[PDB]
Design a protein around this nucleic acid. Structure first.
Ligand SMILES: [Mg+2]
Ligand SMILES: [Mg+2]
Ligand SMILES: [Mg+2]
Ligand SMILES: [Mg+2]
Ligand SMILES: [Mg+2]
Ligand SMILES: [Mg+2]
Ligand SMILES: [Mg+2]
Ligand SMILES: [Mg+2]
Ligand SMILES: [Mg+2]
Ligand SMILES: [Mg+2]
Ligand SMILES: [Mg+2]
Ligand SMILES: [Mg+2]
Ligand SMILES: [Mg+2]
Ligand SMILES: [Mg+2]
Ligand SMILES: [Mg+2]
Ligand SMILES: [Mg+2]
Ligand SMILES: [Mg+2]
Ligand SMILES: [Mg+2]
Ligand SMILES: [Mg+2]
Ligand SMILES: [Mg+2]
Ligand SMILES: [Mg+2]
Ligand SMILES: [Mg+2]
Ligand SMILES: [Mg+2]
Ligand SMILES: [Mg+2]
Ligand SMILES: [Mg+2]
Ligand SMILES: [Mg+2]
Ligand SMILES: [Mg+2]
Ligand SMILES: [Mg+2]
Ligand SMILES: [Zn+2]
Lengths: 152, 275, 108, 139, 155
RNA sequence: CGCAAUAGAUAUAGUACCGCAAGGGAAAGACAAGCAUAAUAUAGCAAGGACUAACCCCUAUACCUUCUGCAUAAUGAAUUAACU
RNA sequence: CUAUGUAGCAAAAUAGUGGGAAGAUUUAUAGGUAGAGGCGACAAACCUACCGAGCCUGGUGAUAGCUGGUUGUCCAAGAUAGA
RNA sequence: ACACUAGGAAAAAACCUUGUAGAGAGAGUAAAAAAUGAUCCCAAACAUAUAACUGAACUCCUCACACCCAAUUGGACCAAUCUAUCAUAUAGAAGAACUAAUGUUAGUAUAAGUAACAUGAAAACAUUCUCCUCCGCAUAAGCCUGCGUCAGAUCUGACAAUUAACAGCCCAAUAUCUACAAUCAACCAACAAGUUAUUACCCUCACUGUCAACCCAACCAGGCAUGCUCAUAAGGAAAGGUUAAAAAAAGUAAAAGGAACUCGGCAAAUCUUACCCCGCCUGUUUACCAAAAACAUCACCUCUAGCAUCACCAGUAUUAGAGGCACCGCCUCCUUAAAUAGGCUCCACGAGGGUUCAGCUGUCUCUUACUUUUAACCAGUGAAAUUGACCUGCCCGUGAGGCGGGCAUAACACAGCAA
């Protein structure tokens, strides 16, 4: 039975789980885009979001500083968190990271995933667009837009 | 290597046998395989049927215009057209006489249909393969086309007639062609459509009103395997009775049996008298 | 325990070729409508993703060559500029990572 | 090796050829083909006796059906056709019942006639004149 | 060791008459010594049994099993050979007529398994699948059987 | 009226390899089984009688050896090929 | 002593719990004792994984009133006193 | 009578009927039907249409005939090979015939694509991070080129290397000597008692080891002496990816009660007490089911032996060998509520055996949650016992998946369980 347990089980125990997610999160803050196994990235996305939330409070706060000290291992990144990432998202109140699935890994055929922090300098991921607005179904729906707007 | 020769040769023979079941050779004229001399074969063809064919006429009854033309063209005598015509004409006349005398009531259309069936390709080819006409006949394409077998077979009958007279030829025809009517029902040789119309026509000719179709017996009216027994009547007297699954089919079969009874071609008719 | 009898080729065929063990035909493949390569719906075009990772790696090699050694995460944003592209009016005060090939058409 | 069987192949195929139509490994493995082929031939031999027994019981069944169609059990039909000195066997009685219904109707009528004659005679007192069909014909 | 498959690409048929239907071309191809079991390669071989070449390549590009890329390389080589040598017109006008996997040779240590992959590509479009047996077909065949009963064991 | 690659020497070799040692001691070179093409459909020593018809119907207690006969009471056999 | 392991990591191990641990202790190195013999703080304990008597070659194709086997076709005669 | 055929009494060697053997889609018979305790009863039914019919390999019929016993015995044929003569036959020969010896050798199956195995994370392939070790470096012993470069592959060939000062390899002869320990060697205290003079020579550095991820265990959580580092300056990686089922394994937590579990407080948690039996003590033993109450052992006693250069012994009756016993001293009714359990003197000791107080605890009343491995799924690599053939049901009876009589019954994976 596992009803209502939101935390995956990975590594050699709870502690190794936190440490694995910590290394993933450090790599993400250092490079702003990493390809990792899908389940691990899905577990780490929440932590990266809340890390940006803690980083918005700013250097002066001590709780946020302790948290970013634990969750960043090469400390050169703590400046970045408080001076490049958190400032970058002064407008967005949520959803700072985008997560996609990518071709499975060559060796062990695992389910992969690229995760990145929105707005970085890197070449943009090939996001999937929706169908062009000029397609047949969209045109008929646009006609319905007009005809319903005039009636109402 | 096991030392020996007998098992090796035995296995080679068995392999050859298997190799002559898959990929059988293209069939070829019996007049090319070994052990063949035409003269003995044609004389034996004569003596086998208990008939004194004249050797020259029988010889020219197996040669066809196709073969003459191919010999003329391949080189860089009489043909069997006339005998074939005589034989076909006599066969038609004699079969007509036979069927008319055996079955008097049958209409001329039906007699002509039976005569066309017996002298048709479907039966003549069958009677000509099982009496070694294809082996002796000369042609281009092997197997000989059924039309060429037919025309050669009637050429042979024509030779028989010109040699031993009408009566013996009539016995020959009674022996090989007429026998083919054995077992066959009437409307398996005389292929017709719309039988009820023909029944009404024939009944009118005998000045009696068209027949009333009733329902004599039935089982399983609603199911998918019904049985309807439909019985025609002619002024309160039965003249037939047919089975079927639909009432339409039962009526059609009642018409067929009534036609057979009026034409004297029932299942239990007096069997032909070969003696 | 151990088997009591060999299992025949018939039983083994009814097990091995049962549908539950067969490989299912995938109903979710298609063609990248613009790029024109195969892809699954919920996954990135493999060829496009590879051509993106190549450029990301080249950019990162330049970044490493400029930062010198480890422990040098800058405290300002970064912008990457290809040949014949002067730093725009918005990118002053941001580190520039020069590259020596024409900007890819897909890089916006 | 001085003498080695050079033709074991044909001795094997003599037994496998009779097993190509079997099911399993016992249509290509000699050790099993032999046993099942031998059982096959033993049943083939022993089955002719059952063939005769079964065709006879089928004929008795068909004759019972036909004779019951005419209100006359099977004991009566056979046990009173012979009393009329008709040596028709059961194969031909079944064939008549299927393929010649009215002839079988007549035979059933004859059997019922002889049965009635027997009952009337036995009911009487003495040796009153025998029935018109109950008169035997001597050799 | 029998090299029969690659010898069926050499049967020279007789020149066609202008009347008879155009004969669909063929190509037989084989990969020898695939370091992979046969009881696993069989599933991939059966997957692409009755589908055109392009759909087969699509289905194999996104399958996980190790032999998928081997089958894909084999099919690509087959397609290239078919266009280049066997005078096929359109490289997409082919379909997997026969796909099978067979045992292999090499030695043990615990058998080190091997396997060959055999593919026959037939020119033309895929044949449609055999349709399901409609109820009328079942009733028709049941009637046919009911209508072939003869009186058993008598004249 | 000797063998012809499981024979003939153990032999391509007393080598490889096993053993601390005495010592032991190989293999081989020139469409059989197993599978695929093609998974199965009530029922039963898997066959026979058959039948229009593959199944359906009726009949039918595997083989060897050992005990007085053995329902398999027990022993032996996965199966092919060679040698015995 | 318990649990794991039982073709196992191992043809006797692993984890814990335990006895000794300046002594009749433990141990590397070369030599010696040789099979009805050696050695033995006697347990029939040990002498190269299997010792109420090592292992190898030879006599040796040991012997076996015991077990198991014993190979083409077809026919015919053929069984339960006793010392 | 059976171990020989066939039909019946349900299945049925032993009761009743029947034998001399082949084909038949012919026939006549033989025997042969009930009356009025424990998984699930067991053919279904039937009171009154003339008694005959059914029923074999027995007998008759048409044809053909040597063509249904074990051990044994007689006979007629014969597969394949070699030789003589033909050139398949007549003869002569012989390693002369395999449905079966837990036969032997080779091939391939089944159990099975099952059990089991492996690569810490990110990356810019330069690097950074997380975590772990009684580990690491060297010599010795062992091994002998066994992750150096290049080129071919997924391991094969070529090329290259380990430089003596360290370590080994030693010595001219003859006589003389050579009483007192070592323990910081001085105090106390002991017992097991631990080279030169003469003669001969005025010569110089040759030879070998030197590599590595290593050796003995068939490839390995095992075995492996010494010096130094005592937690590491050295060395490494417990998770192929996923999900978080059962059963299993290891661990952590637990309400109230605290041995009621059980053979026994085994395991775990806690740390106390008291006695009894055996053995005096430390020690030794059944390498691989017994570590003990057995062996040995100081102490005592008995027996033999007056003595040279190979043991006892370079010893001598307070000695040596062989035996028994086991220091020393003393002699030759309570317990529990309840109970078959426990209760020559002789300190000390025991992983010895039995009992008890108090505590402690998931041992239990009565189980529960979480974590790790296993697990199930995806991907790679891929065994073994076992196997007559299987198209592998239940109940009752016979003597049981397979026989009989009833019942049930479309095919097919996957994970469990153990009748
Ligand atoms: Mg009878
Ligand atoms: Mg040899
Ligand atoms: Mg040899
Ligand atoms: Mg085969
Ligand atoms: Mg059984
Ligand atoms: Mg067995
Ligand atoms: Mg012997
Ligand atoms: Mg005896
Ligand atoms: Mg006899
Ligand atoms: Mg007899
Ligand atoms: Mg011969
Ligand atoms: Mg022999
Ligand atoms: Mg055997
Ligand atoms: Mg299993
Ligand atoms: Mg597993
Ligand atoms: Mg040196
Ligand atoms: Mg030196
Ligand atoms: Mg060194
Ligand atoms: Mg380190
Ligand atoms: Mg895990
Ligand atoms: Mg690991
Ligand atoms: Mg795993
Ligand atoms: Mg508690
Ligand atoms: Mg002790
Ligand atoms: Mg003790
Ligand atoms: Mg797998
Ligand atoms: Mg029972
Ligand atoms: Mg199962
Ligand atoms: Zn794309």
């Amino acid at each position: 039975i596992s009803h209502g347990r939101v935390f995956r089980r990975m590594g050699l125990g709870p502690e190794s789980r936190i440490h694995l997610l910590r290394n993933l999160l450090t790599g993400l803050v250092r490079h702003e885009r990493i390809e990792a196994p899908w389940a691990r990235v899905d577990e780490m996305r929440g932590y990266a979001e809340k890390l940006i939330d803690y980083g918005k409070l700013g250097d002066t706060n001590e709780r946020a500083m302790r948290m970013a000290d634990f969750w960043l291992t090469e400390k050169d990144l703590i400046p970045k968190l408080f001076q490049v990432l958190a400032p970058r998202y002064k407008d967005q109140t949520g959803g700072y990271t985008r997560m996609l699935q990518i071709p499975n890994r060559s060796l062990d055929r695992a389910k992969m995933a690229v995760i990145e922090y929105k707005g970085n300098c890197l070449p943009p991921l090939p996001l999937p667009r929706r169908d062009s607005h000029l397609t047949l179904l969209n045109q008929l729906l646009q006609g319905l837009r007009q005809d319903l707007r005039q009636s109402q | 290597v096991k030392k020996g020769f007998r098992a090796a040769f035995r296995f080679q023979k068995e392999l050859e046998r298997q190799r002559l079941l898959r990929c059988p050779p293209p069939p070829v004229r019996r007049s090319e395989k070994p052990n063949w001399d035409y003269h003995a074969e044609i004389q034996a063809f004569g003596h086998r049927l208990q008939e004194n064919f004249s050797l020259d006429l029988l010889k020219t009854a197996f040669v066809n215009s196709c073969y003459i033309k191919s010999e003329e063209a391949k080189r860089q005598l009489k043909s069997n057209q006339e005998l074939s015509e005589q034989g076909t004409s006599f066969s038609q006349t004699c079969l007509t006489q036979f069927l008319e005398d055996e079955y008097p009531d049958m209409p001329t259309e039906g007699i002509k249909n039976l005569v066309d069936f017996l002298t048709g390709e479907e039966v003549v080819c069958h009677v000509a393969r099982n009496l070694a006409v294809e082996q002796l006949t000369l042609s281009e394409e092997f197997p000989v086309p059924p039309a060429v077998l037919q025309q050669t077979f009637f050429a042979v009958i024509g030779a028989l007639l010109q040699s031993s007279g009408p009566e013996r030829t009539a016995l020959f025809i009674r022996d090989f062609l007429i026998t083919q009517m054995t077992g066959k029902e009437l409307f398996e040789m005389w292929k017709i459509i719309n039988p009820m119309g023909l029944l009404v026509e024939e009944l009118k000719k005998r000045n009696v009103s068209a027949p009333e179709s009733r329902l004599t017996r039935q089982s399983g009216g609603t199911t998918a395997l019904p049985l309807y027994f439909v019985g025609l009547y002619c002024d309160k007297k039965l003249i037939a009775e047919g089975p079927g699954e639909t009432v339409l089919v039962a009526e059609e079969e009642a018409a067929r049996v009534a036609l057979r009874k009026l034409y004297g071609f029932t299942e239990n008719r007096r069997p032909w008298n070969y003696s | 325990a151990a088997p009591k009898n060999r299992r025949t080729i018939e039983v083994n065929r009814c097990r091995r070729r049962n549908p539950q063990k067969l490989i299912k035909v995938k109903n979710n493949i298609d063609v990248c409508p613009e790029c024109g390569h195969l892809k699954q719906k919920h996954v990135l075009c493999a060829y496009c993703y590879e051509k993106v990772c190549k450029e990301t790696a080249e950019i990162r090699r330049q970044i490493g060559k400029q930062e010198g050694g480890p422990f040098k995460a800058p405290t300002i944003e970064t912008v990457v500029l290809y040949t014949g592209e002067t730093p725009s009016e918005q990118d002053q005060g941001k580190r520039i990572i020069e590259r020596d090939r024409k900007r890819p058409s897909w890089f916006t | 090796l001085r003498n080695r069987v050079t033709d074991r192949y044909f001795r094997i195929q003599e037994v496998l050829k009779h097993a190509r139509h079997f099911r399993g490994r016992k249509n290509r493995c000699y050790r099993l083909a032999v046993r099942t082929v031998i059982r096959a031939f033993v049943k083939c031999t022993k089955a002719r006796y059952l063939k005769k027994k079964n065709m006879r019981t089928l004929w008795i069944n068909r004759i019972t059906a036909a004779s019951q169609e005419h209100g006359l059990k099977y004991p009566a039909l056979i046990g009173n056709l012979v009393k009329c000195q008709v040596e028709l066997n059961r194969k031909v009685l079944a064939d008549l019942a299927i393929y010649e219904p009215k002839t079988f109707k007549s035979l059933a009528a004859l059997a019922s006639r002889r049965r009635h004659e027997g009952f009337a005679a036995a009911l009487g007192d003495g040796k009153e004149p025998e029935g018109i069909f109950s008169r035997v014909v001597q050799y | 060791i029998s090299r029969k498959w690659e010898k069926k690409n050499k049967i020279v048929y007789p020149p066609q008459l202008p009347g008879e239907p155009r004969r669909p071309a063929e190509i037989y191809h084989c990969r020898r010594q695939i370091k992979y079991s046969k009881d696993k390669m069989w599933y991939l071989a059966k997957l692409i049994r009755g589908m055109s070449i392009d759909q087969a390549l699509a289905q194999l590009e996104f399958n996980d099993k190790k032999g998928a890329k081997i089958i894909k390389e084999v099919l690509l080589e087959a397609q290239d050979m078919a266009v280049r040598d066997h005078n096929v017109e359109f490289r997409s006008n082919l379909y997997i007529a026969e796909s099978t996997s067979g045992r292999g040779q090499c030695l043990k240590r615990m058998e080190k398994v091997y396997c060959h992959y055999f593919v026959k590509l037939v020119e033309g479009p895929p044949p449609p699948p055999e349709p399901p047996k409609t109820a009328v077909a079942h009733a028709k065949e049941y009637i046919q059987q009911l209508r072939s009963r003869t009186i058993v064991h008598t004249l």
